[PDB]
Amino acid sequence: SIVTKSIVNADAEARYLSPGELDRIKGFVTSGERRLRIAQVLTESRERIVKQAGDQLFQKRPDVVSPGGNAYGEEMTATCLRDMDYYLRLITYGVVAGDVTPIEEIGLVGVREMYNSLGTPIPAVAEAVRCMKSVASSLLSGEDAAEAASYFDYVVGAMQ
Amino acid sequence: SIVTKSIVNADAEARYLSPGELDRIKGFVTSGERRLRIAQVLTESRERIVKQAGDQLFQKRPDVVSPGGNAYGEEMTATCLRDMDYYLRLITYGVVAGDVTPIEEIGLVGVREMYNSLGTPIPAVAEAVRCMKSVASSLLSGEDAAEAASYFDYVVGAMQ
Amino acid sequence: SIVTKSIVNADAEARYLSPGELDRIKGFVTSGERRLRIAQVLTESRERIVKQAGDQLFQKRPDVVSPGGNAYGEEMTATCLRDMDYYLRLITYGVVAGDVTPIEEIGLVGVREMYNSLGTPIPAVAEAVRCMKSVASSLLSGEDAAEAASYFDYVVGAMQ
Amino acid sequence: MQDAITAVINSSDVQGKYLDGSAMEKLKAYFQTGELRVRAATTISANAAEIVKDAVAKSLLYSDITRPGGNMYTTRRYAACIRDLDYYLRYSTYAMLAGDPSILDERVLNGLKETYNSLGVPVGATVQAIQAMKEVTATLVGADAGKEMGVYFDYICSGLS
Amino acid sequence: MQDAITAVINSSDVQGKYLDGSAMEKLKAYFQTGELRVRAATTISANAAEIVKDAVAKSLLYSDITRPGGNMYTTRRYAACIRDLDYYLRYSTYAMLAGDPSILDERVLNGLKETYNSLGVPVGATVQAIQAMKEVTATLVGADAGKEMGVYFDYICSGLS
Amino acid sequence: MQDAITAVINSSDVQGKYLDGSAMEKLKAYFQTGELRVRAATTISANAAEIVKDAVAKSLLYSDITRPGGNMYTTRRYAACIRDLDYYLRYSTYAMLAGDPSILDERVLNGLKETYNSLGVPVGATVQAIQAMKEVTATLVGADAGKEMGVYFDYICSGLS
Ligand SMILES: *[C@H](C)[C@H]1/C(=C/c2[nH]c(/C=C3N=C(/C=C4\NC(=O)C(CC)=C4C)C(C)=C\3CCC(=O)O)c(CCC(=O)O)c2C)NC(=O)[C@@H]1C
Ligand SMILES: *[C@H](C)[C@H]1/C(=C/c2[nH]c(/C=C3N=C(/C=C4\NC(=O)C(CC)=C4C)C(C)=C\3CCC(=O)O)c(CCC(=O)O)c2C)NC(=O)[C@@H]1C
Ligand SMILES: *[C@H](C)[C@H]1/C(=C/c2[nH]c(/C=C3N=C(/C=C4\NC(=O)C(CC)=C4C)C(C)=C\3CCC(=O)O)c(CCC(=O)O)c2C)NC(=O)[C@@H]1C
Ligand SMILES: *[C@H](C)[C@H]1/C(=C/c2[nH]c(/C=C3N=C(/C=C4\NC(=O)C(CC)=C4C)C(C)=C\3CCC(=O)O)c(CCC(=O)O)c2C)NC(=O)[C@@H]1C
Ligand SMILES: *[C@H](C)[C@H]1/C(=C/c2[nH]c(/C=C3N=C(/C=C4\NC(=O)C(CC)=C4C)C(C)=C\3CCC(=O)O)c(CCC(=O)O)c2C)NC(=O)[C@@H]1C
């Protein structure tokens, strides 16, 4: 949160927060209601978002669910969807906090080493997030979809 | 003392003292008698030095002893004089040691933060030392007054 | 040993050994038999090597065994020869290991400070090693003498 | 460190759960307290020197502590002490904004108690000063903010014992 | 660190002795094992990623460890864990080449047990993983090399308890 | 560190007192010993190598300590040891000039005993050497200076046990 981040900045300069930092936090708590609503929608429709996105994903990338693929078979497909649900969850975290930090700290730091080890195709994971973004966005206003877009996009651009 | 200071130097260069350092110490202990006498005079007349200097001080700076001033009233005036006595004392320390270090370590390091906090006007404190210097000098020979001058002056120039 | 040295290198670069390092070790263990034989000869004839070298040494440097010399008298001469035997021993260590490191770690690091303290003439010690080199070399093939030469020479060039 | 928001997140994350009713309600609670927190932080920032000045006068001055042989004797130790107080005030203010004390454990209290023992810093006296600063702060920022600031002043004190 | 050669040297040096029959025989033993050691190290280097991949699948995955609340939960901790495994494999391989475990004491085990306790790293679970890696490695490098690699995998485990 | 002068100052400062008769008398004592201290320091500086050379010959050489398996075995450890002796001599000389041992506590003895245990440095043997150096020094600088130097050699020894 911008609250933590401001404090960390101020501390490193041995000072109280600046009027701008303070004002920034003020506008942050003001928008709290809106971001909570956005997270709430994604929470409530999580099962749909992950199921439909999974279906779209497997259309774009049948290789992962065909023999030789990392998500071949019921159990592996279920684990894949499990992972997608993980990232939808993290994204709702980021939304209430106002930035991508909880996404980073929980799900992106060392994500490359993890998925490489497992032999999971990382670009296909990025694609899966795109797919969730697509489904999620439709359940939101143009305003909220735009705001939520930055969280999905960050995950996609950090899936390297 | 030049003895400590020399040792510290020699140690940082992993060596015994230099012939010059040694000679310096030799001339230092030689002048021990003289500096002791100077400290002894200031010790013996401390009550006069601080009382008269205080009176001169309050002439030059009536604001500090008038309403709104940091030394307003009997108790605050007494605390001020108490402080002056502190610095006269530290100065006698410096005199026997041959340098201003005990003055620094006891009474100047962070003196600004202390007096700012208290709201004590630091230039008026410097002036108080000048006043003590004036009174003290008269009780000494031209030689000893000159030598003692450097200790008072250092305090005044470090009162920032 | 090149085995330790390679490992240390690889570790500092957070990696397995390189194909070249591995190949280097392979050629090292291959030559193990030869170096063992060389050390074995020097071991077996140690008493002769040190006695004859000592005699040659005292011809080249009679000052050390004449009055005023560091090895004057039976006991001091015996201690000198004792030291020579020390270095012959260390050299056999180096031979089996393939490099001069055990010589360095046991007998050269700070050797200057030790011998200076004792007042032992270090160039005369270097000469003593030359003398052992001379005697040792004769008990070996031209091939083995050449290989053993580098160990004696290193000691001589490091006797500073 | 955590703030009130990221703390709730980690609690739900540890359980692998989305944010439920309780979690959402805590976040709401925090946002609703947002502006009062900023306002109090603005006030404390604005009087930071005088708060410590008052707290010192009230609890430490004209005692054995400030006389020859006390832990506040010598100007270096006097400065050190009120420097500690600026610290406690500034981090208490951080913790208050954050609505979470984890920054106190992280950057204030870590090995502090041991340090104070090591140098001879009087812990009881230090705590009297902080508790004085609490009262001075409360007077200044009002009852509600003063109560909250109090949470963190107290948190610091407990860490010192 | 020592290797098998320099260890023998220090043993004879400590006694002020030239190399005798036993010492010479140990050196010979080592040289004769030289090529098998290099060959096994080449093989392990060549499959280092998959050895850890297999060892993880076999002993850690689809458990509480990798679920929310486990020590392998969050991608940072998953990476940390398999990074530890790369370490154990790479140093085990060093120790094997060297025919001596002193590098494990020196650069792996020093204060490791205390660190793991400090962060909450499950030691028993860690050891299951290493013992799994041993079996995977053995399968790969053969019985003789596998036995030797085993010496050092085990050495690490013992240091963890 | 303190010297004899600054020590007296801190004693009077701690009490918030000007220098009285006792304090003034101690300062006088020190100044009167000034030249003898410099003279002895000049002599010790001038023979520093031989003092340690003699002290070593007298207490350490041709023993188990210098043979394979002893703590003075290997040239690196021999150098280390007589390097320690140069240290003890040089700081003893400092302490003597200063007429105060605080530099020994500050820069010599701090965590020394623990270090020596850690590496296997024989403390008793080390102390024999220092006590030998004391006798060698005394012979050299005379009885009065030798007594004073002795104060600090002894101070070091006590810190080692
Ligand atoms: C789905 C779009 C893609 C895919 C996924 C997939 N993942 C795995 C296995 C695991 N995934 C994780 C993931 C995480 N752990 C974390 O802590 C976080 C951050 C919150 C994440 C995202 C883990 C730990 C595993 C290991 C299994 C376990 O839970 O212990 C698999 C199975 C791999 C296997 O061989 O078992 C699959 C299939 N695979 C694809 O191909 C899609 C592109
Ligand atoms: C007098 C010329 C000026 C003046 C002085 C003044 N000082 C105070 C209060 C204190 N002064 C000290 C001083 C020191 N503490 C130290 O350790 C040292 C070094 C040895 C010094 C010089 C301290 C500690 C205090 C706090 C009181 C206490 O002793 O605990 C006051 C009173 C301030 C008040 O509001 O109480 C005054 C008046 N003030 C002037 O205006 C003169 C210019
Ligand atoms: C002989 C060619 C020269 C010579 C030698 C000499 N050495 C000494 C005394 C000592 N030598 C050592 C040597 C070592 N200690 C080690 O750990 C190592 C590495 C393995 C070495 C080489 C030591 C420790 C001593 C001190 C005696 C002891 O063993 O405790 C002497 C005697 C000096 C004396 O005055 O006692 C001599 C004569 N001297 C020469 O002049 C030759 C050139
Ligand atoms: C003041 C109310 C009391 C007091 C304080 C005192 N403290 C010290 C020394 C230190 N205080 C700290 C504390 C912190 N340092 C930090 O960086 C932070 C968070 C950002 C905290 C809480 C530390 C680390 C020290 C030691 C290092 C230093 O000097 O700064 C002293 C001086 C000790 C000395 O003798 O040097 C004093 C006097 N003492 C009192 O009497 C008051 C009750
Ligand atoms: C994996 C099988 C198990 C596991 C591991 C785990 N370890 C850490 C943290 C650390 N691990 C180490 C170990 C080493 N560091 C080294 O440099 C070397 C030798 C070269 C070794 C053996 C260290 C020092 C740490 C702390 C520093 C760091 O983060 O790297 C974690 C993360 C702890 C955290 O919360 O940050 C994890 C998860 N955990 C398991 O669950 C497996 C059983």
Ligand SMILES: *[C@H](C)[C@H]1/C(=C/c2[nH]c(/C=C3N=C(/C=C4\NC(=O)C(CC)=C4C)C(C)=C\3CCC(=O)O)c(CCC(=O)O)c2C)NC(=O)[C@@H]1C
């Ligand atoms: C000699 C009389 C005895 C002896 C000494 C010995 N000491 C060491 C190692 C160290 N000695 C010190 C001591 C100091 N270092 C300092 O900087 C100062 C003050 C300026 C002192 C007093 C330290 C710190 C070490 C460790 C670091 C280092 O190596 O310098 C050794 C070597 C230990 C080793 O195995 O490496 C030896 C041999 N040993 C004896 O047998 C004598 C009785």
